Amino acid sequence: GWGYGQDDGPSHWHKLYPIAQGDRQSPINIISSQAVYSPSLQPLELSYEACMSLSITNNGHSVQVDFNDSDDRTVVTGGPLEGPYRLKQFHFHWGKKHDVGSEHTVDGKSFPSELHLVHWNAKKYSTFGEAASAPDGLAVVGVFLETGDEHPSMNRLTDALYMVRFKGTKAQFSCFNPKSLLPASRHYWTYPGSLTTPPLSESVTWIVLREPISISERQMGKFRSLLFTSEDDERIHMVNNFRPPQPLKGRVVKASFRA
């Protein structure tokens, strides 16, 4: 139905999902000087278990790692959140070159990639799907990826990509701790937004970390080697699977720190 190609890309989604023109769409360009320092905010805590990961999957849009969310062991809490949100999955958005790839931008600057850790409000909703439609249903922590030095923990993931290079394939991915992909800082920006893929529901509290993690150009290349296509179809590389910044429309971006 939708994608990131020339015929089905982001610029066209509004024709299928009208909410794409809504008042709290994501991602956004974060103007650091315009963020409101918010001391009252609570400390952001990412309490992740080491072995809650289930599999790694190429779903045609990204490569996604799914988690066991039957309990509240792997959750995000604090910051703008009133309670814990359980981690359901994490995935990435990236470009064909270093200058593009992230969904959020900071003062007009894009990163080559962006990691999204998707959590849901299991205290208020019965299913991830149900939570994905409600205004306070999801909390996504965004982590920017810069290219430079090799990321040791990332290797276990980038080495697994070959096995899921084609759309619709999956592999077991046990004991991968998502905490290994977080920067040494927990400072962040936060604002009320939406899913960045259809249905584009405005159900997401965004928490974009200030500090990016770094991976090697070689590792970033393993992502650019994935395919949007099936094993039979003509090979079309999975790149530029990101949605561009959307209108802020008077929303206030809060910061946990001072720029």
Ligand X SMILES: NS(=O)(=O)c1ccc(C(=O)N2CCC(c3ccccc3)CC2)cc1
Catalytic (active-site) positions = 61
**How many residues belong to the site for ligand X (CB under 6 A)?**
10
Q: Which does 132 bind (CB under 5 to 8 A by kind): Zn ion, ligand X, none?
A: ligand X
Min separation Cβ 27 and Zn ion, Å = 9
Asked if 132 interacts with ligand X (CB under 6 A), we say yes
| Strand pairing class (204-209; 138-148) | parallel
Residues 92-131 that bind ligand X (CB under 6 A): 116, 118, 129
Least distance in Å: CB of 171 to ligand X?
Answer: 19
Only segment of 5-13, 71-79, 181-189, 190-198 that touches ligand X (CB under 6 A)? 190-198
- Spatial contact of 119 and 76, defined as CB atoms under 8 Å apart: yes
Residue whose structure tokens are 């090799």: 150
The four Cα atoms 202, 16, 22, 195 give a dihedral, to 10 degrees, of: 30
Alpha-carbon distance 93 to 223, whole Å? Answer: 9
Q: Are strands 75-79 and 42-47 parallel, antiparallel or unpaired?
A: antiparallel
Percent helix, strand, coil in the chain, to 5, is: 15, 30, 55
* Segment near ligand X (CB under 6 A); pick from 50-58, 162-170, 191-199, 212-220: 191-199
CB 213 within 8 A of CB 157: no
Q: Pick one of 24, 104, 116, 167: the residue that binds Zn ion (CB under 5 A).
A: 116
Query: Could you tell me the smallest distance in angstroms from the CB atom of residue 39 to ligand X?
Result: 27
> Is 58 one of the binding residues for ligand X (CB under 6 A)?
no
Residues 6+ away with beta carbon under 8 Å from 40: none
Task: By CB under 6 A, name the one of 25, 158, 197, 205 that touches ligand X.
Answer: 197
Q: Look up residue 205 and give its DSSP letter.
A: E
How far apart are the C-alpha atoms of 164 and 100, rounded to whole Å? 23
> 181 or 195: whose CB is closer to ligand X?
195
Between 65 and 215, name the residue whose CB sits nearer to ligand X.
Answer: 65
Work out whether 209 is an interface residue with ligand X (CB under 6 A): no
The residue ranges that bind ligand X (CB under 6 A) are: 116, 118, 129, 132-133, 140, 195-197, 199
The residue ranges that bind Zn ion (CB under 5 A) are: 116
